[PDB]
């Protein structure tokens, strides 16, 4: 069936330069967090950047925070994924891994609406 | 002499079986079920019914974070044999929810060799 | 110069030794015992008494979630040598309870080279 | 352009260097230092000074439970290079205490390329 995607671009709040290596978990209103598995329900190692769930035949599951997948901004500051089942549900991108020299961005509320948007990390 | 329990995960609307829904099992002491091998080591289990007896596994009760996750297979089924006790209440808690679904309500049960459905509502 | 402690896990009713009961050891600072190798790395231990001295392990005190689990063997036995101090109170806390049993009460002890029983009640 | 910091763990009585004492590093936001590789993955570090620059690691600030533990080596040494900032106060918190010792007090520091002692009292 049809799915939805979301992209984010991590940036320095002052210079607007893209920031690599900022790690995020995605939560729903049930207090569960997004975990990617392969087709056999096994954990997968993902790198930085946008994760092509569709091309890799991954599955989205919602799990306890500690078992969640960390998504990490790449060289272009980008991260996210496709393959979301629902575009009307509010999720929150929570910065769990903050690059040194920066403060965590505020939580970013979003829907899987196929858009791209910026997340700013303040220096210091 | 032991007891078993099976569950079948289904879509609450269509009743189609649902694969990949993960569950932990708790007791009234607030501990959760962990399978080990005969030497007390963790084992990797897949989806479906776990034949504890055939594999010589052991059932232990541990902290939630160390617990075994049981996952519905292609036929929506999961569970296990090897329970010592058929009169004790346990709860199946959905900890890993398939995307596009809401978590089912907690399912109270006894290890009575029965099989029963657990429904996940579409989101 | 070091000290050791052994425990024997048993069924409280039958007194039969019980294998697969897992324990963490805490101190009064609320930290828990972790064994490492000579390079500070985690080690996988099995059931039974752990010969820390022979394996050149080290004892460290860490957060509960990073602690080593000691597990009763076929003879119901577990524990270790290599304790630096015999006058300090520690507590053996049952974290992994064999199915069909209740957790034993916490067991206060000192590393005094003694052996003592820990009883798990059925149910 | 980056900064480094070294610490030497010692017995407060004998001043002999102490191996196997584990530390986390926190900032004023209550987050703790985690080293990752270039692809944001966790890395296994051993004891001693961590050459972040040579290994192309990254410093990130995370929840205490996800933090990297730095551990004193044979020479009692630990620390790292690669800090972005030399004017910000951090704290070295002993999380893994060698048996036979008390935890050192928290050690406030800046990444100023210096080396300094941290003392663990016996008992
Ligand atoms: Zn919901
Ligand atoms: Zn209930
Ligand atoms: Zn719903
Ligand atoms: Zn017997
Ligand atoms: Zn044995
Ligand atoms: Zn990597
Ligand atoms: Zn103390
Ligand atoms: Zn201070
Ligand atoms: Zn010195």
Author numbering:
A (entry chain C): 175 to 298
B (entry chain A), C (entry chain B), D (entry chain D): 176 to 298
Give the published text.
As the first reported host of “non-pathogenic-derived” pili, Lactobacillus rhamnosus GG is a gut-adapted commensal lactic acid bacterium (LAB) and one of many clinically investigated probiotic strains for human use in the prevention and treatment of certain gastric ailments. As with other Gram-positive bacteria, sortase-dependent piliation in L. rhamnosus GG (called SpaCBA) is assembled from the ~30 kDa SpaA (backbone), ~20 kDa SpaB (basal), and ~90 kDa SpaC (tip-located) pilins.
As an alternative, GG-SpaA protein was fragmented by limited proteolysis as had been done previously for other backbone pilins. Mainly owing to the crystals having been grown in the presence of 20 mM zinc sulphate, these metal ions were modeled putatively as zinc. Among known categories of zinc-binding sites in proteins, the metal ion coordination environment in GG-SpaA can be classified as an “interface type”, based on the incomplete coordination spheres, weak electron densities for the coordinated water molecules, and the location of the metal sites. Refined models for the tetragonal and orthorhombic crystals (residues 176–298) gave Rwork/Rfree values of 13.9%/15.8% and 21.6%/24.9%, respectively. The structure of a 15 kDa fragment of GG-SpaA that had been generated by limited proteolysis is identical to that of the C-domain of full-length GG-SpaA (see preceding section for details).
